[PDB]
RNA sequence: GGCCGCUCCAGAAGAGGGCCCCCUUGCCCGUUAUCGGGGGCUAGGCUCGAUGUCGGCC
């Protein structure tokens, strides 16, 4: 059986100065044969800790790890700007080696509500036979938003996709796009297209619509 | 001091083959065991294969047993990953990494140096250029504030595309969303800007899409 | 019924072996390689034995 590594939380928000802890439970004992890795987006992993608590050379002493049974903890005593990244555990007591999914360490900031904008498909696209309806959520925080699509008050599923920026370089917000793709045939069967957004910073849902 | 430059990856159809090469600097392959670890897009990390060049001993994950072959060539101080009969679940960034050998250690330990990864995409899609549509400022702006407008960049392969606004003359407020693989094997992507509604009449907004792997270059005006 | 034997078949049979927990490898050890001691479960499943309800021979 592969020993599995389960990492919680999937993400968390903290601020420069904070004490940060990430945990990782092993399916079964690995004794001390756990390592911790740091990875910044689109860049190589770097090793921080091995043997569950040993600091690999060059790893600033702010990093520590400990063990509690099959529970493994990575702790940043006081959080520096360089340390927001994804952290992975790895257990090498038994081959094959195995990794947890990772904890993403994000910047804390205050709540910001999304400005919502809706875009009907272009006449250019409408000629090609498809219709993309785009709905934009600008500069909000925290990441967890919900965009529900309503076509003639009917709720939609399976026909949209979202993409989300990474935290903005200056204000640490998110932006999100959701595209509802239909066939040209279906877009003109209907009349009112609505984007409905729910987020912490919004006391009641924000809806934005158009007709044609 | 230590280096690990990988290469030989890219785009290939299912069934096809590829040879990754991890060139090492600053250490000898015979003082190491080398490893390939992969990261499927948006997912975690996973170990593929390992080799100890001093002994020739090798090891493989089960999903890739019988398709992949790790090997070393110490005269070129380089390790190789031969990949055959590729399926689409082999799409990933492929990182090689080193574990140093320590004659007092009694077993191998963590992966302590990693190289920057090559990308491998396994799709049947054939390189196509993007179609650009405008995302028009609403004909209903709140009259005295900000507006939003953009370019929709649909049906292109492979990544990446690059967007700019007014040929770089507009960066404030620009968000280019990460690309999305649709249900048709092609990528889609949006880029948006906030500008003052006042400027809508007397400032022309033109985005510039450039897709290299197909040598495409578009320029779309956005207007009410 | 005697003598031999384990290629086969028994499970009527030990000891390997295996699994889990602890000790940051902790008597001596350790394949460019994850051990040892301790605690707890594993039996007919693999190797090796033993045995007969097995096989051979006079």
């Amino acid at each position: 059986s592969d020993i599995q590594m389960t990492q919680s939380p999937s993400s968390l928000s903290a601020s420069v100065g904070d004490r940060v802890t990430i945990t990782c439970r092993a399916s079964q004992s690995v004794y001390y044969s756990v390592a911790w890795y740091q990875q910044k987006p689109g860049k190589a992993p770097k090793l921080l800790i091995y043997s569950a608590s040993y600091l690999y050379s060059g790893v600033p002493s702010r990093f520590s790890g400990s063990r509690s049974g099959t529970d493994f903890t990575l702790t940043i005593s006081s959080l520096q700007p360089e340390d927001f990244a994804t952290y992975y555990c790895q257990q090498y007591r038994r081959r094959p080696i195995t990794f947890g999914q990772g904890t993403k360490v994000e910047i804390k900031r205050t709540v910001a509500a999304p400005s919502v904008f809706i875009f009907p498909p272009s006449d250019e696209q409408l000629k090609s036979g498809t219709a993309s309806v785009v709905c934009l959520l600008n500069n909000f925080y925290p990441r967890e938003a919900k965009v529900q699509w309503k076509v003639d008050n009917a709720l939609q599923s399976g026909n949209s996709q979202e993409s989300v920026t990474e935290q903005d370089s200056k204000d640490s917000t998110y932006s999100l796009s959701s595209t509802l793709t239909l066939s040209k045939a279906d877009y003109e069967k209907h009349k009112v297209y609505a984007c409905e957004v729910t987020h912490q910073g919004l006391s009641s849902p924000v809806t934005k619509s158009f007709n044609r | 001091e230590v280096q690990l430059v990988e290469s030989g990856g890219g785009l290939v159809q299912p069934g096809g083959s590829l040879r990754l090469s991890c060139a090492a600097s600053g250490f000898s392959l015979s003082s190491s065991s080398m490893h390939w670890v992969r990261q499927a897009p948006g997912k975690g990390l996973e170990w593929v294969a390992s080799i100890s060049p001093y002994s020739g001993s090798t090891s493989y994950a089960d999903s890739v047993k019988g398709r992949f072959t790790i090997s070393a060539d110490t005269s070129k101080n380089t390790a190789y990953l031969q990949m055959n009969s590729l399926r689409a679940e082999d799409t990933a960034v492929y990182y090689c990494a080193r574990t140093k050998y320590h004659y007092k250690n009694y077993y191998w330990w963590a992966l302590d140096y990693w190289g920057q990864g090559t990308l491998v995409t396994v799709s049947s899609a054939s390189t196509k250029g993007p179609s650009v549509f405008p995302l028009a400022p609403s004909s209903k702006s709140t009259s005295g504030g900000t507006a939003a407008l953009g370019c929709l960049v649909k049906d292109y392969f492979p990544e990446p595309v690059t967007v700019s606004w007014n040929s770089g003359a507009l960066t404030s407020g620009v968000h280019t969303f990460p690309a999305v693989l649709q249900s048709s094997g092609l990528y889609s992507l949006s880029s948006v800007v906030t500008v003052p509604s006042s400027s809508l009449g007397t400032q022309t907004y033109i985005c510039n899409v450039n897709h290299k792997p197909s040598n495409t270059k578009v320029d779309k005006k956005v207007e009410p």
Side-chain angles (χ1 to χ4, degrees):
Chain A
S1 61
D2 289 345
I3 313 193
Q4 292 316 135
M5 297 310 259
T6 297
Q7 251 185 288
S8 59
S10 82
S11 58
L12 67 93
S13 292
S15 315
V16 175
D18 284 1
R19 188 178 191 270
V20 188
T21 62
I22 301 149
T23 81
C24 174
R25 306 222 68 184
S27 157
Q28 71 190 271
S29 186
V30 306
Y31 192 20
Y32 283 105
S33 290
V34 169
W36 287 95
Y37 302 83
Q38 163 185 84
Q39 172 184 49
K40 295 157 174 291
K43 283 185 159 298
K46 315 185 139 220
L47 176 59
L48 311 174
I49 299 299
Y50 56 101
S51 268
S53 90
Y54 297 153
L55 200 68
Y56 184 69
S57 57
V59 166
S61 39
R62 70 181 93 114
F63 293 93
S64 54
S66 62
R67 177 191 171 193
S68 295
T70 70
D71 192 38
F72 285 81
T73 291
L74 171 63
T75 294
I76 318 190
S77 61
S78 177
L79 187 61
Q80 295 312 308
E82 297 70 17
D83 299 340
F84 298 114
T86 285
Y87 292 88
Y88 294 105
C89 48
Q90 176 218 305
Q91 63 92 42
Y92 51 100
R93 186 210 214 297
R94 301 216 309 241
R95 317 193 103 94
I97 63 168
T98 47
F99 303 77
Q101 204 90 358
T103 307
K104 192 192 212 146
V105 175
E106 313 146 316
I107 301 169
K108 188 184 177 214
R109 49 143 295 141
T110 66
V111 175
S115 308
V116 183
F117 301 86
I118 192 176
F119 303 93
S122 74
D123 288 86
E124 268 310 272
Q125 181 176 53
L126 278 184
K127 289 299 172 184
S128 76
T130 67
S132 289
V133 179
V134 178
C135 180
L136 163 71
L137 280 62
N138 215 4
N139 303 126
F140 61 96
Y141 179 101
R143 178 186 277 213
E144 304 91 63
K146 187 173 97 167
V147 171
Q148 284 201 160
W149 284 101
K150 290 188 212 187
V151 177
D152 285 343
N153 229 343
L155 188 71
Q156 304 289 278
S157 177
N159 51 348
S160 63
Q161 315 181 63
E162 320 201 300
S163 50
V164 71
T165 74
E166 294 305 349
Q167 278 194 292
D168 186 271
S169 46
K170 272 177 181 167
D171 57 49
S172 324
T173 57
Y174 298 95
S175 287
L176 184 162
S177 167
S178 188
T179 306
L180 163 89
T181 71
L182 310 191
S183 75
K184 170 196 193 261
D186 289 345
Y187 170 84
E188 287 162 0
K189 278 302 183 182
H190 288 297
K191 211 177 69 49
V192 168
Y193 297 87
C195 199
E196 189 195 283
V197 185
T198 51
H199 181 278
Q200 258 160 256
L202 299 173
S203 38
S204 81
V206 173
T207 283
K208 296 216 167 303
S209 311
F210 65 85
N211 295 255
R212 300 288 182 268
Chain B
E1 272 292 353
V2 168
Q3 272 320 320
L4 269 196
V5 291
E6 322 167 27
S7 39
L11 181 63
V12 63
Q13 303 245 308
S17 316
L18 266 175
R19 181 193 177 79
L20 306 187
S21 48
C22 176
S25 202
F27 72 98
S28 286
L29 276 200
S30 302
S31 80
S32 311
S33 86
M34 310 291 324
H35 313 262
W36 293 91
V37 178
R38 76 198 174 169
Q39 186 159 53
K43 297 314 191 299
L45 295 165
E46 269 173 3
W47 166 81
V48 172
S50 319
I51 187 177
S52 174
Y54 168 89
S55 74
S57 172
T58 69
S59 207
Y60 297 97
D62 287 359
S63 64
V64 303
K65 175 225 320 185
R67 298 179 299 130
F68 293 8
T69 304
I70 196 170
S71 67
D73 183 358
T74 52
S75 58
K76 286 162 176 352
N77 202 60
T78 305
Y80 304 90
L81 185 66
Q82 176 75 54
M83 301 179 293
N84 299 332
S85 316
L86 293 169
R87 301 153 191 158
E89 47 273 22
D90 297 317
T91 296
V93 169
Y94 280 82
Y95 305 97
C96 68
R98 162 197 79 153
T99 307
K100 200 194 189 71
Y101 166 82
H102 291 117
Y103 68 92
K104 183 178 179 180
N105 258 7
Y106 305 135
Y107 56 108
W108 298 111
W109 296 352
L111 314 188
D112 51 62
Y113 191 84
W114 299 59
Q116 284 279 116
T118 48
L119 177 61
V120 177
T121 300
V122 181
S123 94
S124 51
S126 54
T127 73
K128 184 184 162 43
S131 308
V132 188
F133 311 110
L135 294 171
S138 61
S139 183
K140 202 218 298 193
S141 297
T142 44
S143 184
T146 86
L149 59 82
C151 275
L152 173 66
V153 184
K154 212 176 156 246
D155 297 329
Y156 72 89
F157 191 93
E159 284 184 288
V161 63
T162 45
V163 194
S164 59
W165 283 91
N166 286 348
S167 46
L170 173 48
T171 313
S172 278
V174 174
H175 287 297
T176 309
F177 294 91
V180 156
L181 199 52
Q182 317 170 89
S183 154
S184 63
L186 301 195
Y187 283 96
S188 193
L189 169 157
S190 295
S191 190
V192 294
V193 62
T194 44
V195 310
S197 311
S198 65
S199 69
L200 286 188
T202 46
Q203 178 40 237
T204 89
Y205 294 105
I206 286 161
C207 87
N208 326 107
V209 199
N210 185 261
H211 178 235
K212 167 60 194 87
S214 75
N215 194 336
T216 321
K217 182 173 50 186
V218 199
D219 287 315
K220 213 80 181 203
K221 55 184 166 172
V222 186
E223 186 267 354

